[PDB]
Ligand binder design. Sequence first.
Ligand code: MG
Length: 187
Amino acid sequence: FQEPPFPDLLPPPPPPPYQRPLTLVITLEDFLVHSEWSQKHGWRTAKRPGADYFLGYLSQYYEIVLFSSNYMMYSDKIAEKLDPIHAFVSYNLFKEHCVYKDGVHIKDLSKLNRDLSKVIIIDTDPNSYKLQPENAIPMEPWNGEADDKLVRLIPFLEYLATQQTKDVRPILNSFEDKKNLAEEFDH
Ligand SMILES: [Mg+2]
């Protein structure tokens, strides 16, 4: 284990040519997986349609940080079905790494030791990015039904990485509602 200082959560990015143009921070529950209890089956957990492709494909443009909103043991339990694909994640973070202020657990992007102009967070609770909403792409919580909402995020995210932009924050502010970002991306 080689890791961060003072008291930044991530070690420094590798130098070019290995550095990715951008850092993508994503949450775990109600985004990649969904867990539920029924009488017929146990506690079962499901992986979203396209999760494997999503992580594998975007890893070529992004340093992918899986920042769970859950404590680590619970996170590990419901993330089990992500095992064969999990190696494409660069770093793992958990609720233990959030900051507590105003009765809210916040993923404070400034503690990531990353240039904030080069960082995107996708999450299902706006409080998780309460300190840096200008970096955020909101998603409504996944309830377990098959969809392709995940994969449809890719063309815009792929666009950002292959377009030399020196800041990602003014571009997200150029949408007048980020909840329809994927299709608003259609001219
Ligand atoms: Mg799948």
